[PDB]
Copies of this chain bind each other. A is one copy, B any other.
Amino acid sequence: LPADPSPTLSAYAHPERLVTADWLSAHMGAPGLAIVESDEDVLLYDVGHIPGAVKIDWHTDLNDPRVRDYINGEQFAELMDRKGIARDDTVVIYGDKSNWWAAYALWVFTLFGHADVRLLNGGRDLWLAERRETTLDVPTKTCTGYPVVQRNDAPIRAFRDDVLAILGAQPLIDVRSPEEYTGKRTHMPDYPEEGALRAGHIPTAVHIPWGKAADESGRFRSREELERLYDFINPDDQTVVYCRIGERSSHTWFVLTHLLGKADVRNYDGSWTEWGNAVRVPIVAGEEPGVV
């Protein structure tokens, strides 16, 4: 399928990476279009979803159940087959929590080189706010032949040691709440405080809450607004983003990579649940980025 040419999107660096609700509704029933719901709430799809939408749950479908890592290429191909997704399909992903897990799913798809993956602008909440059609019907279509690919981490994923290496050398962006950034908490204010033995941020990390890039409706902010927000980023920068479990940072990862067109942006998916529990890693508290 081709891109949404809506004026809301044309100013973005990769306008092909977002769609509007009107576009999606029009293009339902196209053979090459896959619609995927990805939520924090693993049982939210079961309450009602966009017609034609399949569920891909980040923890249960995309993570290894034993080791802290994603599934392999063989598993991903098996998943695509049973979800009715072909290699050349346009995949449009949406979900709750301001598209956090939808962006995270898009990022995971990118690990496996799926080329055309897009977000529904404003996600599940905008869809419902605008009283658009939902259904309990689950699509039956299955496919075969999705290629078993090499999972390609290096371009878009940063690991603990990678982060340690770039401290002071590259932009590091903490996208969490001020409570988390300053070291008052290890989780968001409205989430049970439990996950890390130390609180703070990674030295040199700058604080830019993920939500600065979206408006009240859940839609991404304009190119102009986003350009200002991340104006400090230069063409030669290899930006790293992080949060607690990588979901809010994948949202920022998406903003930087596709809406602003920045290159070499990596998500440090380990994030604070790794960093704040690791023995002998540098941590700073309070409002200052800190140094070395």
Contact = CB atoms under 8 A, between A and B. Distances in A.
B194 A160 contact: no
A95 interface: no
A285 B68 CA distance: 13
Given A66-B285, A284-B66, A279 B159 contact: yes
B282 A67 contact: yes
Contacts of A194: 192, 194-195
A278 B278 contact: yes
A163 to B, nearest CB: 11
A276 B277 CA distance: 9
Given A273-B277, A274-B277, A245 B197 contact: yes
A278 B274 contact: yes
A69 interface: yes
Interface residues of A, number: 27
Contacts of A245: 197
A158 to B, nearest CB: 10
A280 B68 contact: yes
Interface string A195-208: 10110100000000
A68 B195 CA distance: 14
A218 to B, nearest CB: 27
A142 B285 CA distance: 32
A285 B67 CA distance: 10
Interface in A261-292: 269-270, 273-274, 276-285
A276 B200 CA distance: 20
Contact of A269 (B195, B273, B279, B281): B279
Interface in A65-85: 66-69
Contacts of A67: 198, 280-283
A280 B195 contact: no
Interface of A: 66-69, 159-160, 192, 194-195, 197-198, 200, 245, 269-270, 273-274, 276-285
